[PDB]
Amino acid sequence: SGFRKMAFPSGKVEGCMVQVTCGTTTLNGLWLDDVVYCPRHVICTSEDMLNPNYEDLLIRKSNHNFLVQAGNVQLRVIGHSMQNCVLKLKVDTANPKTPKYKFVRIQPGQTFSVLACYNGSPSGVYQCAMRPNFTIKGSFLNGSCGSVGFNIDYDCVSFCYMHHMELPTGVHAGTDLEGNFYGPFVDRQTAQAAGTDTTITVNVLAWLYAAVINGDRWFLNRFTTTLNDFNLVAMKYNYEPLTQDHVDILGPLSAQTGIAVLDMCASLKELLQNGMNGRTILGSALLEDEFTPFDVVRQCSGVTFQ
Amino acid sequence: SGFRKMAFPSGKVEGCMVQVTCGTTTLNGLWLDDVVYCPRHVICTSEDMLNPNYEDLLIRKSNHNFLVQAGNVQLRVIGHSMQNCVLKLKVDTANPKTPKYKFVRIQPGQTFSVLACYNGSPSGVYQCAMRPNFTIKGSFLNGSCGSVGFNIDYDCVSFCYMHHMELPTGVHAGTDLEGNFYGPFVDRQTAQAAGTDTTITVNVLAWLYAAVINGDRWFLNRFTTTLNDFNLVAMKYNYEPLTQDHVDILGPLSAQTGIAVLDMCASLKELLQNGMNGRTILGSALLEDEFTPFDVVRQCSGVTF
Ligand SMILES: CC(C)(C)c1ccc(N(C(=O)c2c[nH]cn2)[C@@H](C(=O)NC2CCCCC2)c2cccnc2)cc1
Numbered sequence: 001s002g003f004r005k006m007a008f009p010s011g012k013v014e015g016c017m018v019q020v021t022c023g024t025t026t027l028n029g030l031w032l033d034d035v036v037y038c039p040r041h042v043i044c045t046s047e048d049m050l051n052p053n054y055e056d057l058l059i060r061k062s063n064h065n066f067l068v069q070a071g072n073v074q075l076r077v078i079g080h081s082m083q084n085c086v087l088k089l090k091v092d093t094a095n096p097k098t099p100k101y102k103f104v105r106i107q108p109g110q111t112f113s114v115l116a117c118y119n120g121s122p123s124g125v126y127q128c129a130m131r132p133n134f135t136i137k138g139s140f141l142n143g144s145c146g147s148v149g150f151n152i153d154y155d156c157v158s159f160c161y162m163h164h165m166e167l168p169t170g171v172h173a174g175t176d177l178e179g180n181f182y183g184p185f186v187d188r189q190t191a192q193a194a195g196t197d198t199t200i201t202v203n204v205l206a207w208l209y210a211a212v213i214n215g216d217r218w219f220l221n222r223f224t225t226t227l228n229d230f231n232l233v234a235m236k237y238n239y240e241p242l243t244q245d246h247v248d249i250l251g252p253l254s255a256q257t258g259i260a261v262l263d264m265c266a267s268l269k270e271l272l273q274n275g276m277n278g279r280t281i282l283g284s285a286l287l288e289d290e291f292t293p294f295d296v297v298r299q300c301s302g303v304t305f306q
Numbered sequence: 307s308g309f310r311k312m313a314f315p316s317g318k319v320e321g322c323m324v325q326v327t328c329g330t331t332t333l334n335g336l337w338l339d340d341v342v343y344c345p346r347h348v349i350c351t352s353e354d355m356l357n358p359n360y361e362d363l364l365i366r367k368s369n370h371n372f373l374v375q376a377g378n379v380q381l382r383v384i385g386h387s388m389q390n391c392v393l394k395l396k397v398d399t400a401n402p403k404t405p406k407y408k409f410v411r412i413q414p415g416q417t418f419s420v421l422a423c424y425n426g427s428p429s430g431v432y433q434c435a436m437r438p439n440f441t442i443k444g445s446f447l448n449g450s451c452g453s454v455g456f457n458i459d460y461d462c463v464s465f466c467y468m469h470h471m472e473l474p475t476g477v478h479a480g481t482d483l484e485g486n487f488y489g490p491f492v493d494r495q496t497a498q499a500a501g502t503d504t505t506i507t508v509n510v511l512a513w514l515y516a517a518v519i520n521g522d523r524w525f526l527n528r529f530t531t532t533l534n535d536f537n538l539v540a541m542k543y544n545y546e547p548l549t550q551d552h553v554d555i556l557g558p559l560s561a562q563t564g565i566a567v568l569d570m571c572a573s574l575k576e577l578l579q580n581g582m583n584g585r586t587i588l589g590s591a592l593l594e595d596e597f598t599p600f601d602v603v604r605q606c607s608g609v610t611f
């Protein structure tokens with residue numbers, strides 16, 4: 001029973017966090033095998049954050065201009081290369097704590113755990129979603145760059161996010177571990193801003209299913225809806241379109257609870273129309289959209305509380 | 307910037323989780339040096355569950371009745387004893403991953419991180435608070451028993467909770483690591499219920515300070531109050547009393563923001579008496595009470611371990 005924002009256990013990632021210093025700048029790096037991955041903006045100068053040319057900045061660096069510290073041990077940089085917006089520092093020692101891992105680029109709506117770090121040391125762990133506008137609503141202070149996001153389904157760490165910068169509304173932008181930004185953002189000081197965000201409809205539906213699994217049905221109704229009429233209504237509340245792929249993804253939760261996906265859509269339509277009238281759903285007074293269908297099946301019982 | 311429900315990094319605790327099996331029952335244990343700690347109810351059968359005599363059940367057990375697994379390695383049990391509601395299994399190997407640690411008993415209102423585990427394998431981490439009614443609003447399925455709650459200070463893990471059981475409303479009851487229950491609960495199948503709960507006032511105030519630090523200010527106002535008048539309001543709305551010690555624990559946030567505690571208390575008084583008027587605070591339509599003042603300072607200052 002119960003339902004929490006639940007992160008993956010962070011130990012496998014903790015053993016990979018290092019500190020990277022270049023000049024007066026320090027941030028975090030990810031040490032896997034004999035490579036340390038970090039944001040290439042570690043080599044941006046303080047005097048020109050507006051139009052750095054990273055090829056020209058990097059060719060001027062020697063290996064010893066990069067200080068990498070793993071706990072109390074200095075790691076010797078023996079080569080470097082840039083891939084998109086990530087710097088890859090080759091070090092002379094492989095991380096003996098490297099977990100089984102892969103790099104994955106995720107789609108908006110997907111969730112992951114974030115291990116927030118400063119100076120190479122972990123501060124805390126929390127759950128995030130890739131928003132439809134390709135930002136994440138993180139909790140990150142100065143020097144958090146190079147903190148990573150990940151999932152650990154079946155003992156393999158899937159790294160999906162590396163933190164690079166903060167945007168003017170206080171949300172966050174970054175890259176996959178190949179250095180390609182999520183969204184249109186760039187790793188320099190610009191006027192760039194997050195676009196209008198929307199609600200991740202398929203996740204709200206997943207969380208309503210979680211509420212039913214955990215024994216709450218008050219928000220259901222006697223109605224159904226077509227998929228197109230649902231999207232016409234939901235989009236008026238700045239909800240993302242629900243696709244047939246999303247409907248398919250919700251199939252297992254629908255089967256477990258006996259509530260057809262389009263009947264749950266009718267419930268959501270009515271909740272958007274009416275509000276909660278002083279009630280809560282899984283402890284919340286708003287509709288939660290940062291649990292995926294996969295997340296709900298991971299956390300909830302396989303037996304509905306009828 | 308940003309503000310999230312944040313847990314401590316769990317790696318130091320992951321290295322301590324093992325599986326403990328007694329008869330047909332499996333649950334989790336905590337392996338520190340050469341002792342595994344787990345709920346004593348592991349030795350209960352379903353028949354015993356209604357009226358277990360744990361003294362007699364334990365004497366009937368021997369070391370071989372306990373199967374302890376750390377990953378794939380069996381740990382040989384060489385002794386067994388009970389401390390209150392916790393079973394201690396002496397094993398022949400000291401856990402080489404044992405962190406610096408303490409056993410600490412926490413107070414209602416204090417928060418901690420939970421490493422939820424099944425079959426000795428860590429599954430997830432989340433943050434929660436000890437409620438005033440000594441339950442926790444966890445997320446736990448069958449077999450979660452023996453999962454632990456903790457805080458970290460520098461390099462030292464302070465273990466404060468071991469999970470034992472689920473109450474009928476779906477909240478959770480357990481012990482400190484010396485096996486003393488939090489709250490008026492017993493480890494057997496009987497009529498037991500969570501008492502009426504209250505809201506943790508000092509934590510709501512800490513969260514309002516966090517909101518101000520993060521630029522949410524609409525609820526600030528020109529008024530101040532006294533502790534006595536506010537505590538009459540608190541009682542009316544089923545909030546915990548605010549003590550002078552709470553005001554002193556909040557002192558920093560008051561200075562940093564320019565809102566005296568009793569200034570902020572006037573904000574909270576008006577929110578209780580009038581609601582939010584369709585607005586939110588830090589992305590919530592409810593007043594959040596599971597961040598302590600220390601949680602707010604730590605997250606807004608970036609403390610590491
Ligand atoms: C060089 C470049 C690309 C302009 C840059 C500069 C600073 C940082 N930020 C570092 O804190 C930081 C950088 N190096 C070590 N720390 C912070 C950041 O984004 N402020 C932005 C302020 C508006 C203009 C763009 C930069 C930061 C704060 C909180 C959370 N996340 C990051 C990130 C990128």
Ligand SMILES: CC(C)(C)c1ccc(N(C(=O)c2c[nH]cn2)[C@@H](C(=O)NC2CCCCC2)c2cccnc2)cc1
Nearest residue numbers: 332333347350355446447448449470471472493494495
């Ligand atoms: C023996 C005793 C004390 C009565 C007991 C029995 C079962 C368990 N529960 C185990 O899942 C469990 C036990 N041993 C292995 N798993 C679960 C539990 O509390 N159901 C209670 C149902 C009402 C009567 C008391 C037990 C559980 C579920 C979800 C989260 N937390 C725990 C806990 C305690």
Ligand SMILES: [Cl-]
Nearest residue numbers: 105106107110
């Ligand atoms: Cl994805």
Ligand SMILES: [Cl-]
Nearest residue numbers: 358359360361
């Ligand atoms: Cl007894």
Ligand code: NA
Nearest residue numbers: 338339340341
């Ligand atoms: Na010990």
Ligand code: NA
Nearest residue numbers: 527529569572
């Ligand atoms: Na005021």
